[PDB]
């Protein structure tokens, strides 16, 4: 019966102030000992505790972020707000708010603290990106098959989708007719602040001479679409 | 802050198997330890609270034990939905802290990766940059190491790696490593190589090309 939902901007620029709101139902922040905390999860990393606020207005912050974090509650609106100043790309991550139970009570009297040792309900989470990068469509380069990309009777080929912002980008092969042996890797953020990924596929080397291979790249954020034909370099065929 | 070390960092298992994950704290946290399960694209879910208490609604196959600095989470009979990442959290000291996580994936026979290398396309070179790609295809376990060498010089800080999720068909993984250099730099060297290390390989494998040999 407890529900939490995070809201805020999906993209913020460095040095700006980020404001996240957790709206909940199923419990009151006026209930004895109850708490609401924030935890973040940067891309492909572990969970990181940020702060917590309790019904009695007591509050705690991760020491390393103490100066940039501020947490407040609004019992009347069933909301908890987390403010983070001077953000940087290091703060990019999915942010979660979560509920912490207060001690169990018997007719209003605290009897056991065991149930406080956990965050029992988490919200869906909100992904926040911090970047000053402007929207940009990608360039698509071929990863041509060759003797150095062929194992036995199997050949590997692909497309390099480089320098685009923001996420995401979709990739398919031969208008979707080719899916077997296809691997589209997660995008990586380059030092330039632009994203990049590659999509590869393994196919019979005996087909490189007759079968056509084309990767279809779509980047809606910039309304960019590209079809790139990939063939063996003249060094081979 | 209080450090929590989970082990193993990665675990291979099959449905129906019994698995155990351990968490060790830098100092005593009494029984203030919780365990969570997290599936891709979703938030963490509470399994065990206060070291051994079973959260209501959680299947009896999950159990937790320990106190002080050593705790374990056990899943008596592994289920399909159990293939995910697990995390411990201590709430005895501020700031509360989490362990580094333990990923549990589908077990299968060891499979060495097929290593392929791709020199930059003339198209990209013309644009002004050069990207060299090293592909490690369909391997298992997930643990793999890739090193770039340009004319015997180890490259550091100019390559990025990406790994796919475990394939729902053959249970293998694939990885790409991309080395980016300027056009000017690329044309100043001859041999480009990526050395790969994997459990399925009896020794480090090297894949390379010589742009100086035409």
């Amino acid at each position: 019966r407890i529900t939490l939902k995070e809201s805020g901007p999906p993209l913020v620029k460095p040095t700006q102030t980020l404001t996240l709101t957790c709206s909940f139902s199923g419990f009151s922040l006026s209930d004895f000992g109850v708490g609401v905390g924030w935890i973040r999860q940067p891309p492909g990393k572990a969970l990181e505790w940020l702060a917590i606020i309790y019904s009695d207005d007591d509050k705690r912050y991760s020491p390393s972020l103490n100066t940039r974090l501020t947490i407040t509650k609004d019992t009347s609106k069933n909301q908890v707000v987390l403010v983070m100043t001077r953000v940087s790309p290091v703060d990019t991550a999915t942010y979660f708010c979560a509920h912490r139970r207060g001690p169990t009570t018997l007719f209003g009297v605290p009897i056991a603290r065991g149930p406080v040792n956990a965050m029992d309900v988490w919200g869906q989470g909100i992904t926040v990106t911090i970047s000053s990068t402007s929207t940009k469509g990608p360039s698509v380069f071929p990863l041509a098959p060759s003797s150095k990309s062929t194992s036995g009777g199997t050949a590997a080929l692909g497309c390099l989708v480089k320098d685009y912002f923001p996420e995401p980008v979709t990739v398919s092969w031969n208008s979707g007719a080719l899916t077997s042996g296809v691997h589209t890797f997660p995008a990586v953020l380059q030092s330039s602040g632009l994203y990049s990924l590659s999509s590869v596929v393994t196919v019979p080397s005996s087909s490189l001479g007759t079968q056509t291979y084309i990767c279809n790249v779509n980047h809606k954020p910039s309304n960019t679409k590209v079809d790139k034909k990939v063939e063996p370099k003249s060094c081979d065929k | 802050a209080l450090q929590l070390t989970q082990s193993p960092s990665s675990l291979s298992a099959s449905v129906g198997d019994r698995i155990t994950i351990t968490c060790r704290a830098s100092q005593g946290v009494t029984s203030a330890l919780a365990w969570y399960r997290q599936k891709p694209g979703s938030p963490p879910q509470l399994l065990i609270y206060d070291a051994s208490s079973l959260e209501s609604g959680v299947p009896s196959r999950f159990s937790g034990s320990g106190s002080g600095t050593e705790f374990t989470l056990t899943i008596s009979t592994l289920r399909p939905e159990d293939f995910a990442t697990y995390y411990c959290q201590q709430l005895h000291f501020y700031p509360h802290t989490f362990g580094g996580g333990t990923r549990v994936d589908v077990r299968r026979t060891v499979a060495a990766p097929s290593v392929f290398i791709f020199p930059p396309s003339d198209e990209q070179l013309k644009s002004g940059t050069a990207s060299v790609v090293c592909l490690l295809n369909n391997f298992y376990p997930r643990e793999a190491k890739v090193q770039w060498k340009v004319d015997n010089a180890l490259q550091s800080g100019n390559s990025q790696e990406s790994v796919t999720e475990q394939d729902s068909k053959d249970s293998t993984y694939s990885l790409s490593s991309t080395l980016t250099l300027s056009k000017a730099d690329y044309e100043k060297h001859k041999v480009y190589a990526c050395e790969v290390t994997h459990q399925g390989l009896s020794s480090p494998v090297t894949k390379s090309f010589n742009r100086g040999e035409c």
Binding site: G33, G35, Y54, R60 | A32, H92, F93, Y94
Partner: peptide, 7 residues
């Protein structure tokens, strides 16, 4: 520092 319910 000790948790709120630690003492």
């Amino acid at each position: 520092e000790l948790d709120k319910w630690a003492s």
